[PDB]
Write a protein that binds this ligand. Structure first.
Ligand SMILES: O=C(Nc1cccc(Cl)c1Cl)N1CCN(S(=O)(=O)c2cccc3cnccc23)CC1
Ligand SMILES: O=C(Nc1cccc(Cl)c1Cl)N1CCN(S(=O)(=O)c2cccc3cnccc23)CC1
Ligand SMILES: O=C(Nc1cccc(Cl)c1Cl)N1CCN(S(=O)(=O)c2cccc3cnccc23)CC1
Ligand SMILES: O=C(Nc1cccc(Cl)c1Cl)N1CCN(S(=O)(=O)c2cccc3cnccc23)CC1
Ligand SMILES: O=c1[nH]cnc2c1ncn2[C@@H]1O[C@H](COP(=O)(O)O)[C@@H](O)[C@H]1O
Ligand SMILES: O=c1[nH]cnc2c1ncn2[C@@H]1O[C@H](COP(=O)(O)O)[C@@H](O)[C@H]1O
Ligand SMILES: O=c1[nH]cnc2c1ncn2[C@@H]1O[C@H](COP(=O)(O)O)[C@@H](O)[C@H]1O
Ligand SMILES: O=c1[nH]cnc2c1ncn2[C@@H]1O[C@H](COP(=O)(O)O)[C@@H](O)[C@H]1O
Lengths: 331, 331, 331, 331
């Protein structure tokens, strides 16, 4: 073995991230303005725009969930607050029309009662929200929800970063699998635990377990540019979940911050010291202020539409078949 | 598959850019001062110097086209202005002697009338000027021009970055194929759409489709140093098109700018907000002021001549047979 | 041979460092709080926490050795002082309870008398402390110690960075093998001599010689983050030795330094000019002040515990079987 | 072909530079202080220290040549001055004892008379001094010198960077071959012409042609640290030529410069505008002031001695058999 020892499987793969690849142009009859951007969030739910907002207390409360739904995507309400308050944010969203909404739950002792209160409030999607879903307690929660409320509610499980973990969630009955262990902009799991998986390779592996069973993959974390959305979907994901890219919008929670003559908003990991209030796996930081959500979403979808034009992809299902070129450090 | 999934073709190639390679020295009888730098721009047109200026409104209007022709190259007049004005710039150039000139046209509804007005003005070369030529509307335009005015005018099509796209332009009747999707200094297509192709690999692939049919390749975008001209031609291109490297010259349009005691000129993408006046795929920037064009061209051709000496290349056709070494990040 | 010459063995391997790899998540029944972090320092000695402090005069004297033992690890007392003084630091530690302690010795003419004085003082571990253990004088010292005092004292030999060197120490009778030639934060051997071996590959190679003989490997140098501890142990090491990461603690020797409104402590190589008082192979630098040792160790072990959770490793022996993904520059 | 086109030989090799490799430690009986650092400069001439100074007008005139010889190496006098003046510097050196000295000559019309005047002055080594020796005029000059004055004078030819070019100089009768096209610290050939060859690979290739014929290789350019000397010799070179590393010494030509409270000396390429007084292939820069030559040489040889200890190399001939590990960007 060229890199050491006598076991070829010790270093199991070469992991690529978004910056390691570009989409190749292909024969096209598609105008960007005419592409169909709709895609499956879950087995039963299709969104007009393939984007959802992170379940974080500096990204998604009621106002963000309403704006995301109106723009054709969806919000996932965070769970760092009392059960009755999260349930009330669900009703606030449903009171603003027939708008789709999701909400996060954990696997702790209070997680089941939270899930039932969210169901009573009319939630459309429950997200079993963990850092490591390849675990019996998490698989059991997904299965119990699906068997109990699965006719009226779609159940998402995550997060995973390997083929085997994605396969286990499929078997447990997940309606979608969420992919991302380590890639987030505010994540320190890579340096604190030494654990992670570059996202392009993680998506390719998860899709190999999920697509043959008709289960959509949500790419969660590490997306820095509108072009990364196109890359994640071409690797086989059906939607992307965004934190940093939406945290700078007017609709996110938290105050406007002025430093050195420039405007920012606070953005913090749910594993940071501040959010937990210990060995933190996130930081508390800030992102540039970007203006209204509707305008940010227009620009992000605009980049996706351009990629669909260059690759000849009339639908997101066609984009999932596009090819990459791998690039070097120089490029 | 070491990088993920079960499909070896998903990541189709490893793409190299100019900074990834160097030309290897070889046995030589050639003095730099005695090399023959002439090369085919198109099937019928041979230039004394293998260089043309970009069709951009901060690079090429009448003054630049006149200076480029006198230096032994050619200018391509931009199309971001009324038809009658572009046609008048063509006549201005022809009034300064028997000087070669080209002009860009699109594929929109007004593109045919623009092309006919340019023909009436005495243009030598028409460039069908798009970001993605692998498309029936673009192929149809190239073919219609060649069948209509092709006896008196040479027709260039572009841009492409794959073997299959280059092959389609050849079949449509192109007299030259222009290569470059994503590499430009002011380009944001890579980050906005996630689309592109590193230029050395793009040129190697396009040449594999074009050279067997006797059709010259124009390398367009990403050239930062005089040494990159030699690299592009050794990869098999016949000429190079330059934007950033000529935008700082006296003959380019736009004002001299003074910031922090240093002189600059404005340089902007044709896909920037300013040029289009939306999801922009270019930026508005600036480049250092470089002085007269004739002097810049002397230095660029001087570097090319040095490469021809080191590689034993008496002509550009011989340089197209030179070999590379691939280098690492450290180098 | 693609990289030059006709000998495939001239460039013998591709060496990976900690930053080149991440640990992959795996199926897990393990909670971080419930993992067993105990591990073999030597054939006979098992520590509660798999960490020891460097034998350096800005890292480990009596106070550090006492604090390390109380936290469940061990200190190795430096040898840059008179024999009678080092022996007295050993007794100081033993006077603070039944605490484990080690001490460094060289291979010079005074090394044997130093070793005997340390034995008389009640030392638990002798570390034969060199930059290059693949040498007859060093192997002879290890063997002579083991045959003379080996029933009551465990003998460590180092440092090495190849399979063959580790194998030689095993044959000589070492109770543990210490790995690291070139990787230290304050090391200049790589630039002064041009010699070294990236640590992940060095650990994989040393373990291939040591594990089949039941001899533990100590990973020494280059560890910058708590996550690097998990990586070193997963590559097959049984403990890690830390210099820079503990030099900023209250218990290390040396004064608090204030520069630009920030607090630091001095940290210097044992091969720096200052420590030797010549061709130095270390620098004299500084590290940020970090507070009490007990608190730093809590955070480091916290990161290790997180890695054990993500990888499903109930013990350090299970962690030694975990898998890596290799990452690129971009990642 | 993964990187483009259909020709596997177009990208002929992967080129490594000094920063891409480290020397692996090996079994050793060698103390650094006891290593034998002597090595062949040419077929007949052996130096006590394997180092020579560059033929540059900011590195080597009489004073530097005298100091280099006394330190056990040799100086090569530059040729950017009148013939009678260069010949007088040779006699100045010979007047300071029985000291070895070399001098550069070109291949222009005045080169033969320069060579004869240097011979009359008592020069020991003539260096045919070009940027590209794979050329009939250069090969003819080497052969004519060897056949005319070869009994009393050793003849060096260079520079080359390929196996075939080195082989041609051997056939022409060279007593040593000098390797380096593009690597120098003040070189811009890589960016101006796009031509070069990373030095480790260039040395491995040149040695494959020269060592079977008993002809020594001089590694010229790109050496930045004392450790790079050990790397060049392990790749198979017999000596190293130094420019930047000796330009900062008291004995080099040119004035002490004070900028921002720090001391520097001027250092310029022989292809810079200033030296030629045009398309320059070098820059005019500065290096930190380093003090007396004897002290710099002591430190450089000290690093070499350390490498010989780590690798078990008793002589330079043994060091030429040492092995490398290739490292990544991270390392
Ligand atoms: O429950 C947790 N750890 C834990 C507890 C018991 C067993 C096991 Cl195996 C584990 Cl891993 N944590 C620690 C990590 N965080 S996090 O930083 O906020 C975070 C949240 C969501 C997505 C993440 C993706 N990758 C990194 C971290 C992410 C959630 C709470
Ligand atoms: O017509 C366009 N897009 C478009 C419209 C309809 C269908 C399709 Cl498939 C597409 Cl791609 N655009 C957007 C890009 N720009 S550009 O940025 O100014 C530009 C111009 C020329 C060379 C380019 C090389 N690579 C990147 C961009 C370049 C031209 C106008
Ligand atoms: O004894 C030494 N050299 C020496 C003497 C005789 C023969 C031989 Cl083969 C050698 Cl290598 N030295 C020089 C290096 N240092 S050091 O920098 O302080 C140092 C100490 C411990 C771990 C090291 C890991 N890698 C680099 C250097 C390290 C110790 C003293
Ligand atoms: O004679 C020259 N060029 C030339 C003239 C006629 C034919 C041919 Cl094939 C060539 Cl290449 N030059 C230009 C380069 N320089 S230089 O920059 O000062 C220089 C000097 C020595 C070592 C070099 C190593 N690699 C790069 C450049 C180096 C010498 C003068
Ligand atoms: O504290 C944390 N540490 C690591 N990952 C987190 C943390 N908080 C949230 N995440 C995840 O990071 C995603 C956002 O990543 P981003 O879009 O790159 O900023 C979220 O959707 C979570 O999956
Ligand atoms: O706005 C833009 N975005 C991307 N590419 C552009 C744009 N405008 C012009 N180009 C292309 O970039 C080339 C110039 O690249 P440069 O020489 O690297 O600056 C031009 O000839 C066009 O092919
Ligand atoms: O001066 C030196 N040069 C090279 N290595 C040293 C020196 N002093 C100590 N070391 C080694 O570097 C280790 C500490 O590395 P660190 O934890 O990365 O700072 C020590 O345990 C020694 O093995
Ligand atoms: O102007 C120049 N351009 C390129 N190479 C040069 C020039 N002048 C001298 N050289 C070569 O660069 C070597 C010095 O390289 P250095 O030791 O890295 O600074 C010299 O011995 C020459 O072979």
């Amino acid at each position: 073995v060229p890199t050491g020892g006598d076991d070829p499987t010790k270093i199991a793969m070469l992991g690529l991230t978004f910056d390691d690849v570009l989409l190749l142009p292909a024969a096209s009859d598609v105008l960007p303005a005419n592409a169909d951007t709709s895609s499956q969030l879950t087995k039963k739910i299709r969104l007009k725009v393939p984007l959802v907002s992170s379940a974080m207390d500096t990204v998604t409360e009621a106002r963000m969930a309403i704006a995301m739904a109106r723009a054709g995507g969806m919000g996932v309400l965070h769970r760092n607050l009392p059960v009755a308050e999260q349930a009330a944010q669900v009703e606030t969203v449903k009171r603003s029309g027939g708008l789709l909404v999701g909400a996060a739950v954990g696997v702790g002792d209070d997680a089941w009662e939270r899930a039932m209160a969210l169901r009573d409030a009319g939630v459309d999607v429950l997200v079993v929200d963990t850092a490591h879903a390849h675990n019996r307690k998490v698989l059991d929660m997904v299965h119990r929800l699906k068997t109990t409320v699965g006719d009226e509610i779609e159940v998402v499980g995550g997060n995973v970063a390997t083929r085997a973990a994605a396969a286990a969630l499929v078997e447990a009955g997940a309606d979608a699998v969420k992919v991302g262990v380590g890639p987030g902009s505010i994540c320190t799991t890579r340096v604190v635990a030494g654990v992670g998986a570059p996202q392009i390779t993680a998506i390719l592996e998860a899709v190999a377990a999920c697509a043959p069973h008709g289960v959509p993959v949500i790419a969660d974390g590490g997306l820095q540019y509108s072009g990364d959305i196109a890359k994640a979907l071409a690797a086989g994901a059906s939607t992307a979940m965004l934190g940093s890219l939406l945290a700078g919008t007017a609709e996110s929670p938290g105050e406007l911050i002025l430093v050195n003559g420039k405007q920012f908003k606070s953005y913090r990991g749910m594993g940071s010291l501040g959010a937990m209030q210990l060995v933190p796996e996130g930081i508390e930081g800030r992102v540039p202020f970007r203006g209204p959500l509707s305008t940010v979403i227009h620009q992000l979808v605009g980049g996706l539409r351009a990629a669909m034009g260059y690759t000849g992809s009339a639908t997101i299902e066609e984009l999932q078949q596009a090819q990459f070129v791998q690039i070097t450090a120089a490029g």
